[PDB]
Structures are given as C-alpha cells and as structure tokens.
Design a binder for this molecule. Sequence first.
Ligand code: BD1
Ligand code: BD1
Ligand code: BD1
Lengths: 279, 279, 279
Amino acid sequence: GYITVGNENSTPIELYYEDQGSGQPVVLIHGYPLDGHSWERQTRELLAQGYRVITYDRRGFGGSSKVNTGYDYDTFAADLHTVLETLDLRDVVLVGFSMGTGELARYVARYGHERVAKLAFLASLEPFLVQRDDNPEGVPQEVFDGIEAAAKGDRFAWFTDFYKNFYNLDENLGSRISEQAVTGSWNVAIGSAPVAAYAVVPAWIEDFRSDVEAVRAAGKPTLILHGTKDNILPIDATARRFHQAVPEADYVEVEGAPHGLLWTHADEVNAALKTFLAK
Amino acid sequence: GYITVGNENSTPIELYYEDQGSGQPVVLIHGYPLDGHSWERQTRELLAQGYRVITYDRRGFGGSSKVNTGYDYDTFAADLHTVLETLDLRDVVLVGFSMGTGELARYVARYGHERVAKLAFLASLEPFLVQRDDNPEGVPQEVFDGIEAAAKGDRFAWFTDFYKNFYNLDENLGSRISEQAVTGSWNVAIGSAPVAAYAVVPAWIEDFRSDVEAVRAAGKPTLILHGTKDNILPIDATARRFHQAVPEADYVEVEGAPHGLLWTHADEVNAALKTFLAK
Amino acid sequence: GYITVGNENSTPIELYYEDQGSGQPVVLIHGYPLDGHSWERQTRELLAQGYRVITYDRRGFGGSSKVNTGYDYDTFAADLHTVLETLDLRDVVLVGFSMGTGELARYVARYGHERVAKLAFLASLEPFLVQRDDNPEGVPQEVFDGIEAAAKGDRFAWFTDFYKNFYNLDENLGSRISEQAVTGSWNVAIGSAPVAAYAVVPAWIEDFRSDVEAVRAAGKPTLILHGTKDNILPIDATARRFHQAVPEADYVEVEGAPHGLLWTHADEVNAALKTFLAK
Ligand SMILES: *[C@@]1(O)O[C@H]2CC=CC[C@H]2O1
Ligand SMILES: *[C@@]1(O)O[C@H]2CC=CC[C@H]2O1
Ligand SMILES: *[C@@]1(O)O[C@H]2CC=CC[C@H]2O1
C-alpha cells in the first residue's frame, strides 16, 4: 500500500506500508537502512497473538519515495502523523527500533498521544546521542562526521561495514545470523535513496531530551529495551540514560545482544513485546 | 501493469503483470519463489511465434502485493479469474510451472473453461503431493513440515538450499545454469513477502484430484511435461500419476532435467510448447 | 514519481523519475544497464550548486515499465519529449551518459531545442558506432552480434562480463571502484526487463550523424567528454569524431578513465560539469 505524506517538486512523497491481521493496531517503525520486512520475526508473532500489524517504510528507504528533502525528525514525525490519521488508527501500540525510536518520541512531542495506547522503544537513540557542552554523556561528533563521510564516500562499501557492527558479525555470523540474511540486509540497504545513506546521520543525533519529557508526561505504558553489546548505539549513551529519565517505563537489557537484535535475539525481543502488549 | 484482485485491510491487493506482443493470448504462471521474468527463455520464443504473452506475479511474489492472507489455491485461482476477466481474455492458452500448475487446475474446477483454449502443465504439483491414508503415492508430511520450518526459520538461507535442489546444482552449476543466474533467482526470491516463504507450503499439498477431474472433463488440448531428475516434485509422485489420470493429454518426460527446467532445459521446454501451441 | 509515455497492450508505459532541488532544471539520462541513481556522485554536486536535478529511468530499466517494444532512439526520444512536456521544463540542461547521449541528439533532431539551454554528452555513442561501407570509422558489426548473443544467452552472466569492461576492473577494482559498488551495479542491471538486455543493442548502433547536424545547428552550449581508456565506446570511434563534427563544443578527454567514469572519475566529471553549467 502507499500513503501520500507530501510532495517533492512535481512528485508526491508516498510511503510504502503493509496492513495485516485484525485486532488492536500495532505500528512497527524500522531502523536504518532496512525496511518494514526487517520486523518479520516480530510481525508473525504479533499477528499470531491477534494484533493488526502495520509497518511502513521511512521516506528514502524500502518501497517509499527516494526523496532528497526532509531527513529530519520533525518531518519523520509528520510522516507518521499522516499515516496514523490517514488510517484513522486509535488505541495504537507504537514500536520503534533504532531510527524508529526517534519517530515515537518526536510524534508524541509534536502531536500528542490521543491515538496512542502504548510505546515501545527498542535499541533507542534517546535521549541525545552526540556529545555537546550541555550533553557530556554523548558520543563525540567526530564519530558521526566519519560515518557521514563513509556513507557519502561509497554507500555500497559503507553498508557492508555498517552491518558488521550492526550485527556484531565477528561474534554472531553463523550462530545468530546467516551469511544469506546479512546479504538480504545489504540488498535492502542499497535500494535506499543514495542521499539517504548519509542525510539521516544529523537526524540520529538530534536532541530528543524535550521529547523524552513529552513521552514521560503522557503516562502511557512504555517499554525500553536494549542489547548490552550494542556497538552502534552504546547502551550507556542511550538506553541507560533513557531509563533514568523515564523510570516508570518497563526496562529490559538483553544480555549479549548487538544493535541488530530484532533478528539475532528475536526470541528475547518477542518475549518482552508479548509481556508488554498483554498488559 | 497492475490488476486489483482484492483487499487486505486498508490496502488493495494488486498483482503485477506484463502484456506483450499480439495474437492469441498465452498466460504464463510462474513457480515459487520466482516471478514472471523467470519465463524469459519461453516468453521470447512465444512472442517470436506470434502470440500475445502475459505473465503476472502471484500474490506475495515479485512485484505483487506482499500480503499475509490468501496463500491457498482457492484464492490463487480467484486471482487468476480476476486477471482473465479484467483483461477479457478469450481463447487463452494457460501455462503453469510448479506452483502455477495449481492455478490451472483449480481455475478450471472453480470457474470452468469458457475462456480457455489449451492447458499446459509444466513440473506439476498434481494430483496430490502429500501422503495420506487415501493417498498412498504421496510424499510423507514430515518433508513439508521440515520445509515449512526451514523457510520460516531463515528464509534467506532457506532459498539457497531450495535452489540447490531446484536446479540440481551439483550436476548443473556451470553447465546448464551459471552462478550469476542462480544469484538472480535468489535476489528475486528474497523480495517475496517474508510470510510467503512458508505460507505457500500447505497450498502446494492441497488435494487436486477433484480438480484433475474437471480438467480432464473440459476436453481441451492439454500438455503435461516433467523432468526425470526432478528433486522437488518427484516424477512418480506427480507427473506419472497425472498422466495416468488424464491419458488424453500430450505427455513429455524431459530426460535428465531438474525441477528448474524452464532455464536448464529451455530448448526442450520450448520445443514441446511450440509443437503443442501449433496444434 | 512516474510519467506515462505510452501503452503496451493493456498496460501504461510509465517512466520512473525523481525531481529534486530548486533552480534551473538539469535532466540526467543514464547509461545501460543502470538507472537514475547511477548519477548519485553528480546529482549531489549539482543540487549543492543550486540546480533542480531530474533523473528518469529509460523504459525497460530501473523502476520504469519492463516493456517488450520501443527499444529504439525514435521511441527513447519521444519518451524524453513527453517527460519534458509533462513537467513543462524550460531552459533545461540535458546531460546524457552512454545510452543517454542518444536521447539528447535524437531529441533535438525530432523535436527541436526550444526547451533546451545546454547539452552535455558524456561517454557518447555519436556519431555512428557500427562499421558500414559509408561509415569506415565504426566498429565491426560482429562485435555487436556477439554482445547481443551473450546478453540474450544469459543476461545474468553477461552483466558480470559487461561491467568488467565498463569499469576496467583489472585496473580499477579496489582503487577507483569497490567490489560492493560493482555488486550494486549488477543488482540494478538484473532488475531490467529480460528482453532489454539485448534489445537495446541495435539502438546503440543507430546512425546519429544527421542528429549530430541538428545538434550543431542548434547553436546551444555543448560539452563532449570521454575517457581515454574507454573499452566500451572506443574514443576514436566516438568522441574524437563527434569533436571533429561539432568543433564549437567544449571538449574534454579524461586521461585514463574507463566507460564507467561517472563513478571512477567522478571528480573530473563533476569539475567539467561545474565549469560548463556556470557558463
Ligand atoms: C538503526 O537501525 O537506525 C539508525 C539510528 C540508530 C543507530 C544508527 C542506525 O541504526
Ligand atoms: C515450484 O517452483 O513452485 C513450488 C510448487 C512445487 C514445488 C515446490 C515449488 O517449486
Ligand atoms: C552505456 O552505459 O550505455 C550503452 C550505450 C553505449 C555503450 C554500451 C552501453 O554503455
């Protein structure tokens, strides 16, 4: 399916989406540089549990418009807003992974939570990833400069390097992810808009601390889950701070898990989601 | 092109199709987990012979909607019915390969044969693939349980294993199919809906024996063709039984050919189709 | 985005396109067997320079309709005409690479140059690639017969062989193009219509000498640029003749560059385009 969310010059900006099952709506928002199918190990369990599972592809990724403009969380949240309004979804469970955790917080901040039943943040960006004078716990900017340069330099070679650290392949290749599944991740990645390989990096490092305040103040059931061997979003720079800021949220650390834990630790992610959604 | 065949929640179910050439219509219905382009070695010959060649992608595959629902032959036949009615095709030659042989028989059974000139069944599922008390010639259920588990377990690795047996790669890699062509088969396969990797397996093992009765009773020119080294659909469990049940059909055994014989034995398939269509 | 340019039987022929930025329009027309994203190293620089950059995918390639008909430059030029008219583009800079250089010349010949500000021909086909009695400087027909046979014989294996010569991989793999970028070129190539792998070859060898007359007589700023180690379109059979025929055009030979120089020699291509567009 497609939902129109804007225009880029003479072209409509259309987001690809899937809408499956019956029951309470659950919207799953994927990470860079994948698409909605990256949720497949979660999707099939949620459908079996009697939820209506919707995924969509972020602008620039998967089946969505390969735009040059709007790679920022205000726009990403406006896109999500249009998806929810177009489908008139109510009592929705929003679940974000990696980039998708930014949509969740920015959406609540900008649009409120009238449509939202629950929030689940998996392998989160929050609260503010890049080190600044007022954000000493962040990661130094030079890391992101280097990522931007590599992704712009040759996105094809860059995605290979990214997935090594995404999945901790030195540890997990052949035990928790096959070579073929890694290849599938890379084939999806190179289908993204060339500019999206690097244009999203400034978005990853936006300050979400005010959005975290909105999330906490919404008082909706919230889950925060992260792997302890995450080499993309270090757990001390993200989830542990997020947990401190939103102490009311359910909090899960998946021992030994990398950033790409929807696949490598699907069982643990699924168990956490099942418990959380049942509440 | 796209033809709408139904809806999945808020999304239309659209089948991708191509419609080429001029002359009597010939509709080619591909096998799992490929798409309409898998017919390319046949398509170009049929076009050269002065047929109008139409292919479409089965729901869940190729360019068609990546649905969760309807992976059964009643639905697959209803999809084909809508394609034929939408295009108002008459005097059509229907040609199925592997999964596509199920559409042909179920379509005739459910909708009759007013639009159909001829039927060609290549590497067929018929008459009833899984062993049961009333179907002693079938293959034991545990085979299909294992396939379902592998395809659900990691579809990316599974498609590699499937294509080894599909093409008999130990024998044919480098002689009747290149490494690059195998890679092309795998790239198409992983584009299918994640759930479709395993959801189609129960469909493969539906009982087609009543549909075979409808096909035989239609009295239209029919061709049944199969490879003698088919390690996906064993010739004794399928084509030889189909031939016994429909003795009036033209019958071709391609000596030494695997399941993936549209590619590996394109010349033999093309020669059979040319003779059959000329009748 | 899509622009409808015709019909193939029951299906509209739709060209995929992107329309980005603001400023004077620049339309980039890709080479075989790639798509509009193959321009990414040029696109991002032109956008940064304040141009509106439009790319589209030629029929049969990338995201455009996978047709069987119309693989000839009269049709390719008519497609471009429809793109320019549909978008009502004026003062356009047309830039062609490899196959795309044919659209530029045939378009001016068939439709004139009222909408055109400038023409840039990169790695050009012109003036007439195949040797004939009246074209002694061309390449012998047997070369193209062999290419057609290989591309029809197994397009998957053929694209591997093509890209070796396209990029001069013996020299450039690991220094000016990564293995991963080559893989990205091959993944895009195999998505093209099967018939397009070979149907375009007769188009490449059309006589463009009359079109070159139209281009020269238009008196618009023109650039001709070619690599000196082009092993697809030999520089003496193409660019040097084109330069002799249109002596008024700016002329650039990129020392040591292969056919695939948008990637391998992006800096040199970009510098030439920047200078040319600034005029
Ligand atoms: C996920 O999948 O999306 C982005 C944002 C967070 C870390 C980098 C990348 O991984
Ligand atoms: C073909 O291509 O489609 C299915 C059905 C028959 C055997 C398994 C698979 O192969
Ligand atoms: C480019 O990319 O397109 C065609 C036409 C010219 C030479 C062969 C091929 O390369």
